[PDB]
Amino acid sequence: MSKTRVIYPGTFDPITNGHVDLVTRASRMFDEVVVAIAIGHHKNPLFSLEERVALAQSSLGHLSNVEFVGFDGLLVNFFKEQKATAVLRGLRAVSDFEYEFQLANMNRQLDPHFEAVFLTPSEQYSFISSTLIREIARLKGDVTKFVPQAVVEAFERKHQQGW
Numbered sequence: 293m294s295k296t297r298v299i300y301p302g303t304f305d306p307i308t309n310g311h312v313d314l315v316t317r318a319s320r321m322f323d324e325v326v327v328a329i330a331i332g333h334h335k336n337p338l339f340s341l342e343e344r345v346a347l348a349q350s351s352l353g354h355l356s357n358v359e360f361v362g363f364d365g366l367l368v369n370f371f372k373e374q375k376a377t378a379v380l381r382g383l384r385a386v387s388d389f390e391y392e393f394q395l396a397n398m399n400r401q402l403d404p405h406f407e408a409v410f411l412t413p414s415e416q417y418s419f420i421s422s423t424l425i426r427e428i429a430r431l432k433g434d435v436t437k438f439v440p441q442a443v444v445e446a447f448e449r450k451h452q453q454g455w
């Protein structure tokens with residue numbers, strides 16, 4: 293018996309009730325879960341790295357075995373650095389599936405010890421994308437059903453600072 297450490301990479305911009313569901317579910321079949329926020333150094337996200345990790349920690353803080361780190365670089369190197377068992381990914385949109393199968397088969401060429409595991413979210417979380425959430429918030433639309441309160445207020449305070 294070893295001790296399992298799954299990495300859950302994402303821009304998490306912002307974290308969604310979807311992401312929360314998956315991380316809870318992962319937290320039950322793995323010893324450590326690392327919520328790994330991509331800095332996206334050349335990607336251009338809406339929430340600062342600090343904003344994102346905050347909203348993450350706010351929503352999943354109460355889970356003993358969940359850690360939160362930022363990271364940039366190849367996900368493969370981050371994987372090796374973290375002596376990770378496997379990389380956690382969620383499946384729901386079919387176009388999802390073909391890229392996930394590609395990023396999984398490709399990273400494995402880079403590091404043979406590389407592993408993806410996949411979860412499906414609750415049918416109530418399957419339609420939620422960070423991107424759709426941004427665009428609904430962006431147009432002064434209610435996202436309380438789709439993201440944690442933390443994030444609701446956080447949108448209200450990009451609106452207070454303009455937007």
Ligand SMILES: CC(C)(COP(=O)(O)OP(=O)(O)OC[C@H]1O[C@@H](n2cnc3c(N)ncnc32)[C@H](O)[C@@H]1O)[C@@H](O)C(=O)NCCC(=O)NCCS
Pocket residue numbers: 301302303304305308309310311314330365366367368380381382383384388395399412413417418419420421422
């Ligand atoms: C794919 C990258 C960009 C981040 O993933 P993504 O942009 O999809 O992030 P997102 O914030 O949406 O969350 C990530 C994960 O959560 C899942 N997810 C998002 N919303 C939901 C939801 N409502 N329900 C279930 N799962 C969900 C996604 O399908 C994904 O598996 C990430 O792997 C990365 O930045 N990699 C580093 C760059 C790299 O090395 N690239 C080439 C070699 S890997």
Ligand SMILES: [Cl-]
Pocket residue numbers: 439440441
């Ligand atoms: Cl909530």
